[PDB]
């Protein structure tokens, strides 16, 4: 029953803005503090912003201070995060997270029902925020032509944005397939490759096709990988 649904991700231009939203339900929203935690490319967690039950106390992270604003609407169970002057380094998965339902003051007195943003017991599925200045580009699909077995694959090079999906033989081939995580290149474009190991004797008979699809650029490629 207890849910936190984010909304408001996507592609942002350097210098642009974005407002995140989080709808809480299944609990007394009024009693809890809230926060946002981001997760960068191949990285860990970074505490971004947090506000307490009545939105009166609100702190931010060093790298985001002065650019971001957090706020809430208890009568409608929403918590927002305004993001101004975004930079490429801000590219991360943003999680809406529920803080405590209590707090302690400087005197060591614990206040029940007045939550804050120390730690987070409930986390949303998170939303991806991509901050790049790149135009949409379709990838170039290249063949990776072939102990006791043989390896072949496809090179999916220079595309934007994420993601692409790769399959072998329209989905008929799964065993041995390793589709690698994309790597961001110095140009801001992504590249990846998908490989599969097969019996070295089947090369002359069985045909192998890789199915590459990149929706944002309207690009589908079916490449037949041969010796």
């Amino acid at each position: 029953e207890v849910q936190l649904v984010e909304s408001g991700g996507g592609l942002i231009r350097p210098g642009g803005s974005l407002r995140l939203s989080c709808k809480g339900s299944g609990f007394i929203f009024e009693n809890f503090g809230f926060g946002w935690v981001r997760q960068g490319p191949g990285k860990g967690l970074e505490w971004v912003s947090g506000t307490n039950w009545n939105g009166g106390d609100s702190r931010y992270g060093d790298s985001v201070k002065g650019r971001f604003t957090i706020s809430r609407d208890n009568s409608n169970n929403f918590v927002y995060l305004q993001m101004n002057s975004l930079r490429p380094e801000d590219t991360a998965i943003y999680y809406c997270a529920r803080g405590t339902d209590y707090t302690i003051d400087d005197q060591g007195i614990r206040y029940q029902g007045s939550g804050t943003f120390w730690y987070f017991d409930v986390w949303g599925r998170g939303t991806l925020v991509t901050v790049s200045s790149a135009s949409t580009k379709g990838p170039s699909v290249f063949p990776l032509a072939p102990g006791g077995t043989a390896a072949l694959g496809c090179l999916v090079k220079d595309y934007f944005p994420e993601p692409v999906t790769v399959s072998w033989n329209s989905g008929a081939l799964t065993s041995g397939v390793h589709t690698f995580p994309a790597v961001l290149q110095s140009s801001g474009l992504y590249s990846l490759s998908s490989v599969v190991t097969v019996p070295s004797s089947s090369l002359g008979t069985q045909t192998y096709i890789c199915n590459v699809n990149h929706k944002p650029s309207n690009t589908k490629v079916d490449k037949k990988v041969e010796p």
Partner: protein, 214 residues
Amino acid sequence: EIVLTQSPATLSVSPGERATLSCRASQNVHPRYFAWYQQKRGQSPRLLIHSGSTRAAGIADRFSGGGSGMHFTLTITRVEPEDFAVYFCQQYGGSPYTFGQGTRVELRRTVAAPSVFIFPPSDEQLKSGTASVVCLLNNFYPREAKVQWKVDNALQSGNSQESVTEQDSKDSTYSLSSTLTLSKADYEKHKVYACEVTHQGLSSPVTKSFNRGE
């Protein structure tokens, strides 16, 4: 700002064994102001311990937390198969609140040498000004592995990119790719293209190579 450094970066453990994670703080942190999280692949973080030693909701009693000052720990008494994930420490004794870099608890299997393959650039790609050579390291353990490119014996640097799969769910192995990207003109001026792999399961560095054109 308070910096949190976790160690080790990777704890390779077998099921049923004891696991003790460590977090080090740049400054003194109050013992009752610390938290730990678990992070499975593709999932959101989940609170394990809060306020230093208190287990969160629905957390198995095999998890425990302790520490003070600049040294905090998380202990799994006996790791179950559903305990393999990344773990984050987090301080909130001082603002701005900070996390650790994370510690991946991996399934420790037996050592397995990688299968190694090398792929020359397609002619199709060469007909477009660039040349990419790919070295494939299939199914190996542990994941620590050195890949070195060489072009006419001269070993390369600053022009390659590695990518590694998540640990396999069926045989607990890793696969790695390395991509050497050259300009066509550079690719034309050399014959020998080699990928030298160093790994623990190899008594000596394995080399797969090819002569351009042949």
